[PDB]
Amino acid sequence: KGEELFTGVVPILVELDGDVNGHKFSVSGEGEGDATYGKLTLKFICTTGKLPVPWPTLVTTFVQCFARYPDHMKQHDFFKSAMPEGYVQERTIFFKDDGNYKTRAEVKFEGDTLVNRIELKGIDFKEDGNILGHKLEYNYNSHNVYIMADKQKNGIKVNFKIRHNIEDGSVQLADHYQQNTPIGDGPVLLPDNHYLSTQSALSKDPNEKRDHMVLLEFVTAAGSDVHKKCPLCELMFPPNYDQSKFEEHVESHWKVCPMCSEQFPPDYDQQVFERHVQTHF
Amino acid sequence: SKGEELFTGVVPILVELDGDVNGHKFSVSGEGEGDATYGKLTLKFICTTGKLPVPWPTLVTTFVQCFARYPDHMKQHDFFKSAMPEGYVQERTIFFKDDGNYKTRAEVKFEGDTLVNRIELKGIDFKEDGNILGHKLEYNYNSHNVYIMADKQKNGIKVNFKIRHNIEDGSVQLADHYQQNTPIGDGPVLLPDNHYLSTQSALSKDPNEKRDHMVLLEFVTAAGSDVHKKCPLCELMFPPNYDQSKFEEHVESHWKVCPMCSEQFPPDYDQQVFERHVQTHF
Ligand SMILES: [Zn+2]
Ligand SMILES: [Zn+2]
Ligand SMILES: [Zn+2]
Ligand SMILES: [Zn+2]
């Protein structure tokens, strides 16, 4: 059915189970999404007491299938083309000078409803760092989500850097390493490299006493022809510069196998990467 | 309180702007609605005179902070609403770093049931292939904290913040905002303690609209403390539980302040002219 599911308002459900440095918690979310606009509305409750991490840290984690792809780009919309069987979205999120989240989500239809079921593990976080110290402002900014085909899987590798504003006016960065791969064995769109321009606003229902977040998200697809910047680092490329070498550069941030050049999140814990390299010898 | 009673539900909004930036004349009209109970604000703009000569994001701040959600424990600090329905004059100078500036004069006030922001805007000293006239801003917006101060000399507020406009080459164009609001009517108004408005915005598009336009969504809510706070307009830091009057003093120092009556002027204000204001006291 694919893009035909997304012509109107789709109801959304979200469930997450999380363990960050041993603090276990669960969140439930409900709302709806309108890919015609790229518009997405979602309210979250913490179902297990008071949330141990700040809500903004979870925003990316809580459905890029609701992006508006312009007509001239329908052919690059992986997200929607894997539906309704859906996809696995995995991420590692490196909070600079602090811990990281590792997430595994399945996003897919369950009847008429679009569901994001997530499990999330955080480790190595500082106790009075920006995350566990609750030092993030309750807000969000624009970002450009760079998207690449992983032809040799049958999905996408995705990269971007979130800017979380800190109550002392500094910024906490969070590098996102993301892969999406289809759940069904139907065929899917393998896109050319492009971006999703995302914008967000977090607010609060004033008649809600529980600890919650209301997230509004506006996502729409694109992708420039003079100066181009790297998604992860701030490296700036001169005007009109071999786009395959830009790509090469981005890949280089991933941990790369010297044999088959498969990419992995650049974790401190090499254990999983080390298992892969032994597959060749 | 009195004027905050108008803002208890959904209020319709109208916006008109006339602009001259480096001689390029243009007009914009806007319409939408605002819900202060949520701090929610929705607005669609058209350019009524042909091509918009500056990028839409540059105009966002310019295009109704009376729709902010003030928490119950802060109703007493809501100037915006307390001046309504006669409303207020909002004036701003906006300095685009290494580029020109906007100077704006708006009246925001009720006209019947409808809340209206009528604006006159003048821009000058802009570079021809700078980020503004070169159309190099990305179509998006970020969070900002709008710091608010009383000015009893004028019976209103002085307001400051620094907008971050993302540039298509991944750099950022900063824009420093110097703002004053003064009441239009004779009635008394709330003179607030220093606080700030946490604003967040998203620009999108109506896909059924063929004309060049902007849809603006804005979420504003009031706050402001224990920890380190950076000045609204520079990277200088203030330590925990700092003397809040000296913070104010510091902020004022980014403006031109008359040492007699303490009337405040934006920092580009001509020295010669500032010197004749001071002679006004002798
Ligand atoms: Zn890079
Ligand atoms: Zn390998
Ligand atoms: Zn300062
Ligand atoms: Zn004076």
GROMACS .gro file of N, CA and C in nm, chain B residues 12 15 59 99 102 119 125 132 142 163 168 181 223 251 255:
model
   45
  293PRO      N    1  -0.887   3.556   1.701
  293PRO     CA    2  -0.841   3.565   1.563
  293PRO      C    3  -0.736   3.672   1.549
  296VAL      N    4  -0.244   4.047   1.050
  296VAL     CA    5  -0.114   4.111   1.047
  296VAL      C    6  -0.093   4.185   0.917
  340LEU      N    7   1.178   3.785   0.905
  340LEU     CA    8   1.061   3.860   0.948
  340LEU      C    9   0.981   3.799   1.060
  380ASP      N   10   2.606   4.273   0.856
  380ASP     CA   11   2.511   4.303   0.752
  380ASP      C   12   2.423   4.416   0.804
  383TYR      N   13   1.713   4.594   1.057
  383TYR     CA   14   1.574   4.635   1.047
  383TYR      C   15   1.545   4.729   1.161
  400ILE      N   16   0.249   4.682   1.112
  400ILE     CA   17   0.391   4.706   1.122
  400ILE      C   18   0.445   4.791   1.008
  406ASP      N   19   2.165   4.944   0.497
  406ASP     CA   20   2.305   4.896   0.505
  406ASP      C   21   2.321   4.747   0.475
  413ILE      N   22   2.104   3.797   0.383
  413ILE     CA   23   1.967   3.841   0.368
  413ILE      C   24   1.933   3.868   0.223
  423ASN      N   25   1.473   2.833   1.526
  423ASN     CA   26   1.515   2.763   1.648
  423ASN      C   27   1.457   2.824   1.775
  444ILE      N   28   1.860   3.611   1.799
  444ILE     CA   29   1.811   3.506   1.709
  444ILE      C   30   1.925   3.437   1.633
  449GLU      N   31   2.241   2.814   0.471
  449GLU     CA   32   2.248   2.694   0.384
  449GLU      C   33   2.388   2.635   0.366
  462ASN      N   34   0.839   4.795   2.439
  462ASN     CA   35   0.694   4.803   2.427
  462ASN      C   36   0.640   4.909   2.523
  504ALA      N   37   0.887   3.226   3.194
  504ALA     CA   38   0.966   3.168   3.304
  504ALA      C   39   1.066   3.267   3.366
  532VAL      N   40   2.277   4.430   3.123
  532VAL     CA   41   2.204   4.424   2.998
  532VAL      C   42   2.185   4.565   2.942
  536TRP      N   43   2.281   4.875   2.557
  536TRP     CA   44   2.211   4.990   2.502
  536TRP      C   45   2.293   5.117   2.529
   0.00000   0.00000   0.00000
